[PDB]
Design a protein around this ligand. Sequence first.
Ligand code: SF4
Ligand code: SF4
Ligand code: FCO
Ligand code: FCO
Ligand code: SF3
Ligand code: SF3
Ligand code: F3S
Ligand code: F3S
Ligand SMILES: [Cl-]
Ligand SMILES: [Cl-]
Ligand SMILES: [Cl-]
Ligand SMILES: [Cl-]
Ligand SMILES: [Mg+2]
Ligand SMILES: [Mg+2]
Ligand code: NI
Ligand code: NI
Lengths: 263, 263, 581, 581
Amino acid sequence: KPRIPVVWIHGLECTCCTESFIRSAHPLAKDVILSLISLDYDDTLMAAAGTQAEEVFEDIITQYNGKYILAVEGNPPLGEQGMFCISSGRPFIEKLKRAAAGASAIIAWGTCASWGCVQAARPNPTQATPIDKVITDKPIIKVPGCPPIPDVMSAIITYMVTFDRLPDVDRMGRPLMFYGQRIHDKCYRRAHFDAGEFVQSWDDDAARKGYCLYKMGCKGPTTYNACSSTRWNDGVSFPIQSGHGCLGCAENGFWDRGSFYSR
Amino acid sequence: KPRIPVVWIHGLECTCCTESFIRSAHPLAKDVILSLISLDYDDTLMAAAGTQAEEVFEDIITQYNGKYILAVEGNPPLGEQGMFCISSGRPFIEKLKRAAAGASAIIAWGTCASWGCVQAARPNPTQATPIDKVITDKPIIKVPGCPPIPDVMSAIITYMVTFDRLPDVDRMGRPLMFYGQRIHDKCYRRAHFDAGEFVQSWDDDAARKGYCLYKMGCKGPTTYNACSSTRWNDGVSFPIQSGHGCLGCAENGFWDRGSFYSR
Amino acid sequence: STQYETQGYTINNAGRRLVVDPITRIEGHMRCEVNINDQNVITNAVSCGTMFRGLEIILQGRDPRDAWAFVERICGVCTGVHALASVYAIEDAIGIKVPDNANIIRNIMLATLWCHDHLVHFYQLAGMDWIDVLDALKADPRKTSELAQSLSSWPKSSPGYFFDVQNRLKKFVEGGQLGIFRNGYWGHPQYKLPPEANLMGFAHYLEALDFQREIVKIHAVFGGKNPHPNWIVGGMPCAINIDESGAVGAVNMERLNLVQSIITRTADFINNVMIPDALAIGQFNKPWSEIGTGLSDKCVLSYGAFPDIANDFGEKSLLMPGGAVINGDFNNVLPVDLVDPQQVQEFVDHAWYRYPNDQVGRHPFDGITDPWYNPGDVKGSDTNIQQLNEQERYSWIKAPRWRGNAMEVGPLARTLIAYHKGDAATVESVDRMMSALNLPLSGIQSTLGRILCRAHEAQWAAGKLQYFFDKLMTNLKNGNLATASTEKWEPATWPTECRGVGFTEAPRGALGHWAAIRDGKIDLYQCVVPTTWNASPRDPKGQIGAYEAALMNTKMAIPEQPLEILRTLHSFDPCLACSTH
Amino acid sequence: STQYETQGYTINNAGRRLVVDPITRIEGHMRCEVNINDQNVITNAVSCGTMFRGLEIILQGRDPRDAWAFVERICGVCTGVHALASVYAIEDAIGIKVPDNANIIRNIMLATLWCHDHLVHFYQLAGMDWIDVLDALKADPRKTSELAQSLSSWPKSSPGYFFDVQNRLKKFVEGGQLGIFRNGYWGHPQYKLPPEANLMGFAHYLEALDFQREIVKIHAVFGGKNPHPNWIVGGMPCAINIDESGAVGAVNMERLNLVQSIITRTADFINNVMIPDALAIGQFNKPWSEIGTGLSDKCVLSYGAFPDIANDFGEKSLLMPGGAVINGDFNNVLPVDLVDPQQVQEFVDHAWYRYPNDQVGRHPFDGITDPWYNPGDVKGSDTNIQQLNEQERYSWIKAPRWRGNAMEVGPLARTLIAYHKGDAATVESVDRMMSALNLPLSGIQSTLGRILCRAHEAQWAAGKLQYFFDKLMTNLKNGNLATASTEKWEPATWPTECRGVGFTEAPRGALGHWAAIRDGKIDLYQCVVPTTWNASPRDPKGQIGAYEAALMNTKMAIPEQPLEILRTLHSFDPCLACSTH
Ligand code: SF4
Ligand code: SF4
Ligand code: FCO
Ligand code: FCO
Ligand code: SF3
Ligand code: SF3
Ligand code: F3S
Ligand code: F3S
Ligand SMILES: [Cl-]
Ligand SMILES: [Cl-]
Ligand SMILES: [Cl-]
Ligand SMILES: [Cl-]
Ligand SMILES: [Mg+2]
Ligand SMILES: [Mg+2]
Ligand code: NI
Ligand code: NI
């Protein structure tokens, strides 16, 4: 039986969300690609380059018009007529708009596509702009994080394929399943927060006992993600577990909320 | 290069601690047995039986007198002249005392060897008695839990082999590294406990959001172990993460502290 | 010395007496004695459970809701099966019906256990009776690769791999620290595998030791941990949330993905490693299709298991059939009723317990667990048993009978019941398996057969895991998420007095828990567990249990080296903590 | 059209122009244009970075302690290397010395990245340039098994496995949904592997895709997550506690055990899968030992990496050597000084930036990042480029030079430097590798060589992982637990004005971050990244960079199919986000 077509495009980005996806432990990214979806366009992985890649793009969005999922990593820059990000000699935004027009639904992978991420931090030299400020006539599912958790990304895909529906979202378009609660609402160091047991300098006795990172700048109290429950890399760790406060990396504007080490 | 001799004996027990040991993810139990220790006697796994197994036992404790670690799972019953647990036609306690006399140190695996566990629960029909009430002239490391965590068991072994010393212990003989803190001091649902956000009946809306299990009888606040940090089965879960309160299974007398579903 | 006849056997305690204590590569504590005649053939066999804990006594006065947690600790090998029987028993007493997803998840817990337990038994417990590990050092790695590739598609078969495994073993043994291999039976003439098959088997022993840890991740997801997962009366505690805020606090899509990944890997390992190894052991040890028959051609028992219709424990629901055969009449599979006082009864005339009348058997609702260590004259002392006195009390295991018949339980028993009830999958599998070995059907009724049936059950259970997972996902797709019924959670909702039976098929055979509740507390809790049946002592008629019967008439090559005894006992997968509880 | 001479090449832009945009199987955005003559030989090559973000502008005004987190997001492929360069730079500026364990753990983080990144590049990025995936459908599974087993001890080699892999591919393509394989170059005459080698390579592609996710578990233990782990100025935040209360809150023995397990599996996979595959690609594609030489026989550059003596970045400390070679004089490895204004300079006469004088280069302490999109007289228009004008500005990538020389960086560069400095392990590895291929040492100075050296380096780094791990454990055994220096954490302790350099060897080559701090805030932050060197545009002298040189003189079998262009470009492992930042 045919697999659901997926078109994955890349604007201004660092490719972290792509790398996160291939880390998926269950289902393995191999099995997602071979058995669950048809990954029909992807600059990172595809054999074809140049004019052969353009032909793939055109053929897929034409033959499966209205029927593919569009995954977007990165964002379009509005500076310099869009030519801060060039694909096939034209602004990236033209590729984004063409891809969007034929999509049944759009997944905005990562904080770049969802909100802006690092390139949109002050002073935003390229006028990098999130997808939902350019594409205003289509469902956008925001999957923020820098990058999002690997098994979150694959769980969202398996949900769409198994249940044949989009995940339910919050008012910001984030899947409720993984972004309904704050990091700090499921953090295993909350005991220490509640007791006033804080790391005050790196590698102090508090740090060696796993005390709370709030005084070292942890932004878990204002950050919605699954890092403190699902965790990272097949459950091995998350930022806080390995001794660094949450940066707030799933939240809009997190680079410009002051120093990561300040309250 | 010779490996440290280990003699593993079994009194009254259910064998859960042996099964836990073989679940180890890192190091694999395979590598522990082939490369880290010399598991020279073990009823569960050894080829030899009967007179052949008696010969192994006698030869190892004689050849390596003063130089083997004795691992004990289970406990001796004092009822019926010890014949509630029989080994080569004689009370288990005799084998325990023989093995103990030659050991350089003793690991008491599990709540059975440490404290008593289920056979010692009221009314303790067999007069099951923990190892440290019978063996009183040897270092005993208590590793409690029913069973202890697989990767905690293997971490203790690796520590002893790598560092050539026993773990430092609390006033009850439990390794500080994994028993220094309470389950509730590192529980990812502590946010909910602090907020008065509790499961009140199974599968209520609170349960489906991962709320605290205190009103369902969770004994995490008085239980010391690594379950909420290290977690179980290669970090996959622990009791509370899958929706059941902690029973208190690492603590002396936990079966007789009232219903697991009461305060 | 005396001789008497029972069940076609001549029980004769003349001749040399051999003692095997401890039995190793089992769970818990067992002693075995035999007598052998001048042809070194066993003419008398004595099964003895050398431990007792008293969970039936400890359970009195507990809250019924807590019972599962206590009785789970009957056994850490068959971990979870006593919890399942407990919640079934309490639910049967009170009159609780669980939601479909709870039933499905319970079936997943049980199938997961079957897979895990049967795999570890095959390699770590029984394997070294059939694989001469030291002989693997003589194997040619290329011929080993060739053998493995002829038997299986399994990837891990390169000559380099087998050389590396062999070299690991060589280095292990070279320093004289042979660990679990020390003072083994290596070189015994009953080891029949060629060196290449011994190296293949050893490599797989190590692969199975690694892989078995993964299987139980399913128990960690639904049950919190393994060993000894958690359960509730009323369903399971692992609440589900797929698509709502706070799914991070529940069984969600990522958790279910983990489960699916484990199921696939579990099927693949069993089908391409365990199954071919079991058939290879058969190919090289065909005479063991004629050794250790015991009661397997006379009397076998299954209660059945895996209710597919939630809260229905009838024949149309149970995916694993129940039934009894007696007197070797497999054309009449009889129905089993666990409430009927004339059916399951336990005797203690040959066990270390008191009854008011030790000549009668007690159904478990009339059961008594009053320990009485009384070995009589054992050619030593009460604290030095040199020879058990099998004319009197000789075990901590009670003697269960079914309508007064001594029965075998477990994988072979179950296979025979399903086969003779006309289960199509079972008929086709059994016929194909024995055809491949060029053996008659009767060859399954044997020590070899017990091993073959156990492996085929691991395959069966791995298939059922997928079926049950797909059933759960179908309910989730349809918005049916419920995992607990709590209408009768509070003791004020229970009958003042009620009783119930919880039953299933544990990896080793038919399991029942009989519970009576009064005034909110357990008044009586009696367990009859599969190894209790199989390892049973004798009864007032002198009838022998499954272990003693299977040992009868067995040739030993070398009396002092009990390999034949170990082979047959291990083929039943003895769990002594279960047997005695 | 014009023609001029530089670096032994004739740069001629007469004749047919080919455009490859987008370059795929790279990170980020690249455009490549070439001219080819009548003989289908490339006479001109144009490297264009088609993206820019401006991290150097974004860092102005930030707290130096935060800088690592921003610059880590230069790249999620080489994740962590910019964080390392950043903490080094800030520590250099302020005068901070980290504890030995922090240095060892940073070395572990970098070696982990080398292993991961190299492995994924080999299979997922470059592999399909060499392996004809559709041709694998024609292989014989037994001959594929025999080939694999002849090359490696790796276990997973059975005929049944290769058949299963083949059938998976067969099923994948059977519905006409070829996915990443659609409209590929399959069948092109430069595909030289036999069908069996193609199926072997494709199986390995899939095994590597699975296995790479494990390697980065080391990042998760010490750095919280991958991609994009966490770091601190002053060391690492992953406090250690082995034997004290609260070790559950820190890097403890169980966490270290997980790290060791990953290191062993990583070495095994690299040594027994990637290494033999690289050699096999060499065996079947020896003509590519003479294609794509570029600058690799003239000018190569390494800064060096992996300081083994904490806080000592000198020659006696760095385990991966630093040095420069120019004019093809490999007998003269020259010392590199990243503070010397006459050494590293960047030019922008052919890039989209403003300088006060674009005919001169600026050292990064004098760097300027003032974007200016000015493609000038293109064929087409500024928003619809048909042909870049390489006589003017044509790239978002600045042009770095070393003492005015155009250099190649990366694994081949490093290998040449270490070889010619007399590093015994490098000399042995290279000599053995080229002996196995029956190729001269010069054969490494090539497109094939870049791939062979990258595999070499993955092996090297996997060995170094164990070395660093052992060093860490040695400290812990001696009670040396410290992981951070905090005496200069607070801004008031810093110099009011200071500057520093942080450098290392990323997977793709020499990386440097130059930072100036004033009044507690970043005043200047300039990055010169390895792909900036290799993908460089031209300088005022017309000197071409490593990619343009390596493409020069290349034969194309089929002008419309850029396979040879892709092979050479992919051999450098382009990271375009890195190049432009
Ligand atoms: S470490 Fe961060 S998320 Fe966790 S309890 Fe402290 S402030 Fe909250
Ligand atoms: S679930 Fe138990 S351990 Fe966790 S916060 Fe609640 S009471 Fe404490
Ligand atoms: N299987 C098993 Fe254990 C036994 N006998 C139980 O029940
Ligand atoms: N490797 C790598 Fe990325 C590049 N170029 C950096 O630094
Ligand atoms: Fe995965 S591209 Fe990496 S920067 Fe923050 S989300 Fe963006
Ligand atoms: Fe591992 S034997 Fe299992 S009952 Fe509680 S620790 Fe005891
Ligand atoms: S920094 Fe990001 S990865 Fe999770 S813990 Fe905080 S949202
Ligand atoms: S029941 Fe035991 S396993 Fe851990 S969570 Fe509580 S100590
Ligand atoms: Cl794209
Ligand atoms: Cl943002
Ligand atoms: Cl023992
Ligand atoms: Cl206890
Ligand atoms: Mg009983
Ligand atoms: Mg720069
Ligand atoms: Ni059992
Ligand atoms: Ni990069």
